[PDB]
């Protein structure tokens, strides 16, 4: 009696369970009856094993040098991104389960080796950037110039990239509200926003590419320029 009603909905339930498997998110429909739920679970496991196998097989095909087209690589890169993030989430949860992998005496051995080096070098530690720091506008201009260099002739940037360009040119306008905001972030901000990941598909290996929120990118870029300037100033990094 019912096939114009439910045959589309259970197909959407199939595709929704598969979308929730690909996303590592919970799929439990409460109103779905558990034999139908068990068969969708079974379908998702079979498609999961096929999907993992065809992602790894297409990757050995692409990496070996076999001739593929654009949609196979694009599809493969999406499959491997979800598989690499499943493995990375399992790696993070294995770290949360199996403790710090470095032992306490192993950590203090590494740490005392570092303090004996930095005492041997008479290393004065890099302070917090002072309020009227002599070079903070120089390092801010280098930071925002470096963030601007990340944008080329792709006349079409999305909402976040042109919002980043707006925050960069705003920090170009008033550099001292930018520097005060950056030092406020370096002092108090300990919870941040979600860092986006994707993977640059070199065909030999996937390189992770991280898109940070642009206020945090400006604070990170000033911090990067500051610490590298002060560590070159204090000779933190030996010439090797």
């Amino acid at each position: 009696g019912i096939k114009q009603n439910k045959a589309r909905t259970i197909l959407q339930h199939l595709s929704e369970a598969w979308r929730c498997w690909k996303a590592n998110i919970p799929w439990k429909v409460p109103g779905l009856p558990t034999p139908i739920e068990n068969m969708i679970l079974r379908y998702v496991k079979a498609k999961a094993d096929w999907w993992t196998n065809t992602a790894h097989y297409n990757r050995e095909r692409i990496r070996r040098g076999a001739t593929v087209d654009k949609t196979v690589c694009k599809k493969n890169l999406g499959r491997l991104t979800r598989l690499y993030l499943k493995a990375e989430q399992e790696r993070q949860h294995n770290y949360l389960k199996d403790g710090p992998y470095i032992t306490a005496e192993e950590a203090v051995a590494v740490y005392t080796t570092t303090v004996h080096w930095l005492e041997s070098r008479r290393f004065s530690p890099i302070p917090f950037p002072p309020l009227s720091y002599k070079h903070d506008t120089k390092l801010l201009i280098l930071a925002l110039e470096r963030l601007k260099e990340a944008y080329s002739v792709k006349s079409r940037l999305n909402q976040s990239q042109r919002e980043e360009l707006g925050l960069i040119e705003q920090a170009y306008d008033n550099p001292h509200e930018a520097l005060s905001r950056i030092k406020r972030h370096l002092l108090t901000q300990r919870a941040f926003k979600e860092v986006g990941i994707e993977f640059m598909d070199l065909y030999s290996h996937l390189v992770p590419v991280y898109d940070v929120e642009p206020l945090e990118k400006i604070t990170d870029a000033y911090l990067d320029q500051y610490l590298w300037y002060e560590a070159d100033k204090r000779r933190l990094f030996p010439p090797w």
Partner: protein
């Protein structure tokens, strides 16, 4: 002098090659374990 009444001209000037204008080389506690 007052000199009240003075023109302005908003232009998109100052385009150059980003080298120097005049072609010159313009040059101008510690850690302790106890």
């Amino acid at each position: 002098d007052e000199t009240y009444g003075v023109n302005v001209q908003f232009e998109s000037d100052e385009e150059e090659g980003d080298e120097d204008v005049y072609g010159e080389v313009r040059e101008e506690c510690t850690l302790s374990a106890n």
